[PDB]
Design a protein around this nucleic acid. Sequence first.
DNA 1: CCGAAAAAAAAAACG
DNA 2: CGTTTTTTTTTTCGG
Lengths: 83, 80, 82, 83
Amino acid sequence: STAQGQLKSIIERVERLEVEKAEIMEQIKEVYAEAKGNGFDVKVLKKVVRIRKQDRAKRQEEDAILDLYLSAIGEILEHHHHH
Amino acid sequence: NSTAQGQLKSIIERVERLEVEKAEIMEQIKEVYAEAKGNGFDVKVLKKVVRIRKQDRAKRQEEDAILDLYLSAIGEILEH
Amino acid sequence: NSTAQGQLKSIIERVERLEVEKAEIMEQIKEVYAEAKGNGFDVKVLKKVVRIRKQDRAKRQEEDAILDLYLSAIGEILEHHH
Amino acid sequence: STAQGQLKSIIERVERLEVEKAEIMEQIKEVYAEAKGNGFDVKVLKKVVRIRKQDRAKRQEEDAILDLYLSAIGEILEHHHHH
DNA sequence: CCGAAAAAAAAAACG
DNA sequence: CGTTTTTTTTTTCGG
């Protein structure tokens, strides 16, 4: 039936995507293992990745607000030029 | 603290790319579930179905692992 | 602040006693495994057996939970035709 | 055989102990939940409990070193009670 | 936001 | 010692 087929496609797509996600997580562990093999401190590395992630989030908030300012300026410009 | 730092950069950049890909996957999963809800499905029940199937596969590999432990223990006893 | 201080110490003290008890339990578990090891058992295999049995109990609990979801969803569909 | 019975008592004792352990973890979680219900921040509470645990480890190590000093002094005292 | 469920990070046991 | 699981903290995600 159509509902059985929809169910099957849902479970199938989710399970494939989660396979891919597990592959990504495993590759990340590969990078950390190689970093450790070259003498790096994995724990501080993970802390660095977390900190850079947090700073990146702040920058994106700043960029969205920045775009608000740019939008208001854009309206002021179009109004200035015509009339 | 010189020529290791160039490698450090490759490390962090590779990690950041991989986590980008990971977030893209998570987003696709969320999209599939939201479309399922839009087609009248209960996302919570769907996730429980996926969860149980995942646990069953994990158990099956676990039992393969205990089997391998048994065969190894026997071989260790018989070799020495 | 002030009045909360009496509650704070009672909380931390009860939790810390409970953590004492939990650590004592972990010690007893290690004792059982060590004595079995002294009797020739393979501790790793034993832990795997305990772990598999626990996974079976978890799986059965999950099956009961999804069963309840099915029953509730059926009740939802039927009770909201009227 | 006797090894079958030993196996069974082992598995049952461990499983009984892990039952007890899960009940204790539940009591801890409940205490934190009611504390939160009284307006506390659970995360900071857990951080404090962890810090006190770390202090307890530090003091017990230092107390063991203290015992080394006390024992050596005791040896000097037994030597003294001879002169 | 909450409460459960996944994942990351931290801690510890085993050889 | 270190590694390779276990335990805890942090994060996710639907409601």
